[PDB]
Amino acid sequence: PDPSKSKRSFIEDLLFNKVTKF
Amino acid sequence: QFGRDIADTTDAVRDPQTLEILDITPCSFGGVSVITPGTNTSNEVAVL
Ligand SMILES: *[C@@H]1O[C@H](CO)[C@@H](O[C@@H]2O[C@H](CO)[C@@H](O[C@@H]3O[C@H](CO)[C@@H](O)[C@H](O)[C@@H]3O)[C@H](O)[C@H]2NC(C)=O)[C@H](O)[C@H]1NC(C)=O
Numbered sequence: 296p297d298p299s300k301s302k303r304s305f306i307e308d309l310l311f312n313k314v315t316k317f
Numbered sequence: 318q319f320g321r322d323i324a325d326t327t328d329a330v331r332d333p334q335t336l337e338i339l340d341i342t343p344c345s346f347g348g349v350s351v352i353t354p355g356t357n358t359s360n361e362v363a364v365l
Contacts, residue, residue, distance in 0.1 A: 316324045317343040 296302040303311065320329025320338075329340050352363040 316322060316326055 297305055297308070318331045318333075319327055320340075322328045327341060329338055332339055350365045352365060354361070
């Protein structure tokens with residue numbers, strides 16, 4: 296976890312960035 | 318005269334007498350769900 300933020304790690308942020316009526 | 322969402326559905330309009338733009342948002346709806354302890358334990362409920 297990178298606590299400076301949601302306690303996601305740095306590599307979890309890359310993964311969260313790279314992905315992408317009623 | 319009309320607006321569209323990506324799924325090819327109406328989502329905005331010209332008012333034909335005062336040409337400002339209105340967003341059409343669908344009326345609020347959804348599932349009604351009853352939270353409950355076991356009816357052996359209590360007769361109380363809460364609703365989502
Ligand atoms: C359809 O008909 C209606 C009614 O005749 C039109 O609405 C009116 O439009 C005029 C301008 O064409 C508005 O005049 C303005 O009034 C304000 C009042 O403070 C003034 O400050 C401005 O200098 C100007 O004189 C009038 O208010 C307006 N009335 C309403 C209730 O909106 C309408 O424009 C017509 N629409 C089409 C698409 O033809």
